[PDB]
């Protein structure tokens, strides 16, 4: 239904090694499709997905061009902030950029993003209306005042509402047989006894795409939240995802708990209950 | 596609 495209830029100064490390990547939904790494041989934007390879060489040229510009703007940015935060040239600092856009099932614009971070904190970001900036502190107030005078908002907006969206739609069609797929989770439950007293019920969801899932435990059909462990959704390596939820349980009361699984690939949600 | 607009901070 909903879809996104997002580019992610990280640049980290290597004082002494001079040239800062710069890595850019690009995603459609939860599938990565392009990368650029300042330390790689190719010095071009590389493909990280079959479907984008079909794009012709005008494309690859044009993205390599743009990404180099990104790399440049960041190398400079690193120094600018160094001075704004009155820091010295002996420490390694990190600048991060993220932008992209989102569309409904209609494939129309919903939201756009443009945001910066310096050393793991917010720096500056474009508000949701894409007409104005949020300056995280005093330092970034300076970048705000500048980008206001230079009518940056208006332009970036037009990219995010316009260009960004069209390219997503294209990527989606071109990668229809991958990006537009709904891989429903394979689900099982396991039982491991810690004592004669308690026992752990673990509810699994494997081989699913996209990564957006929900697993909740329900005691007697009431949301049981308390004696609960829930691992971070994790990537399986082959483009699918994994998650599990756990409840430790008074033994004899095993069939009092049910695992509930919601995912876009399932017609109806799933209810799973330990079967011996 | 990346954007064509890039501004320094």
């Amino acid at each position: 239904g909903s879809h996104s495209m997002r580019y992610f830029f990280t640049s980290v100064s290597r004082p002494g090694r001079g040239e800062p490390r710069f890595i850019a990547v690009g995603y459609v939904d939860d599938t990565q499709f392009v990368r650029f790494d300042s330390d790689a041989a190719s010095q071009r934007m590389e493909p990280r997905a079959p479907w984008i390879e079909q794009e012709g060489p005008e494309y690859w040229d044009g993205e390599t061009r743009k990404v180099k510009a990104h790399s440049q703007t960041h190398r400079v940015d690193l120094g600018t902030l160094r001075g704004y935060y009155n820091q010295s040239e002996a420490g390694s600092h990190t600048v991060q950029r993220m932008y992209g856009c989102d569309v409904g099932s209609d494939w129309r614009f919903l939201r756009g993003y443009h945001q910066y971070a310096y050393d793991g904190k917010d720096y500056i970001a474009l508000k949701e209306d894409l007409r104005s900036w949020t300056a995280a502190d005093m330092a970034a107030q300076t970048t705000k005042h500048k980008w206001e005078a230079a009518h940056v908002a208006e332009q970036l907006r037009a990219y995010l509402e316009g260009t960004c969206v069209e390219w997503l739609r294209r990527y989606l069609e071109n990668g229809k047989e991958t990006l537009q797929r709904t891989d429903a989770p394979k689900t099982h439950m396991t039982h491991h006894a810690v004592s004669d007293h308690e026992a752990t019920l673990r509810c699994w969801a494997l081989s699913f795409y996209p990564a957006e899932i929900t697993l909740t435990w329900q005691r007697d059909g009431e949301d049981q939240t308390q004696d609960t462990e829930l691992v971070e959704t994790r990537p399986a390596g082959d483009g699918t995802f994994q998650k599990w939820a756990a409840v430790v349980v008074p033994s004899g009361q095993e069939q009092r708990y049910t695992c509930h699984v919601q995912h876009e690939g399932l017609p109806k949600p799933l209810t799973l209950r330990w079967e011996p | 596609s990346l954007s064509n607009r890039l501004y320094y901070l």
Partner: T-cell receptor
Framework: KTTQPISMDSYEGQEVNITCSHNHIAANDFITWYQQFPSQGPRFFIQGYKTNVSNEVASLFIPADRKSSTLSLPRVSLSDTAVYYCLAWGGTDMLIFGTGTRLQVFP | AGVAQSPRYKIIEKRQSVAFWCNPISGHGTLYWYQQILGQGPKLLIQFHNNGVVDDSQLPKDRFSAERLKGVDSTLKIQPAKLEDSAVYLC??????????????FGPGTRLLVLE
């Protein structure tokens, strides 16, 4: 891509109107016109965005939907005889000049 | 202020070397080499910012090459030349190659004619 007439003739003292065609213009792209005289390099002439613009050398009429644009030399001199290139681009984007429109101003 | 290039004209035999020179506007950090085949407009060959190549994806590396080792004057060079390289070689400079869209300042060209 811009698309424009290959050549255009005119008499001195008239208003001249060259039409650029840019239907697949990107939403942040600007409309920009270089002028090249014979045996010189191209020089920047007029640039516009989304609202009509006129400097002290020409006028750029830009419709709302920006599928086409029109350059308007107000009253041509023989000295205005030159190629007029029309670009629709922005920021870090290559210039793609094309064929231009060779204007000729007869006396 | 204008961009300067040397020379204005150059006649050369097939398979020989030739070299154009350009001095950008003082301060302009991005320089460009274009090729203008007769009756077309200029197409980009190579783009420098300071002393480094930002774009060369379209340059014929078999024969063309360029330099801007101090980030100011530049030198484009064909070797060995072919007949079809007969063109005007234009040079341009920009303050930067990023932002809203930067106006380019061109030099007056070097006319190259390669003969059999």
């Amino acid at each position: 891509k811009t698309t424009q007439p290959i050549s255009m003739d005119s008499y001195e003292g008239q208003e001249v109107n060259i039409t650029c065609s840019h239907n697949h213009i990107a939403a942040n792209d600007f409309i920009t016109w270089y002028q090249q005289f014979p045996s010189q390099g191209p020089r920047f002439f007029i640039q516009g965005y989304k609202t009509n613009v006129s400097n002290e050398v020409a006028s750029l009429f830009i419709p709302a939907d920006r599928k086409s644009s029109t350059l308007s030399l107000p009253r041509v001199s023989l000295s205005d005889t030159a190629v007029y290139y029309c670009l629709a681009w922005g920021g870090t984007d290559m210039l793609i000049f094309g064929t231009g429109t060779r204007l000729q101003v007869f006396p | 202020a204008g961009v300067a290039q040397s020379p204005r004209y150059k006649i050369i035999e097939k398979r020989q070397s030739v070299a154009f020179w350009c001095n950008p506007i003082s301060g302009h950090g991005t320089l460009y080499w274009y090729q203008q085949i007769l009756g077309q407009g200029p197409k980009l060959l190579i783009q420098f910012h300071n002393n480094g190549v930002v774009d060369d994806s379209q340059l014929p590396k078999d024969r063309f090459s360029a330099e801007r080792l101090k980030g100011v004057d530049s030198t484009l060079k064909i070797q060995p030349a072919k007949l079809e390289d007969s063109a005007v070689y234009l040079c341009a400079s920009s303050l930067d190659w990023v932002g809203d869209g930067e106006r380019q300042y061109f030099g007056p060209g070097t006319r190259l004619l390669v003969l059999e």
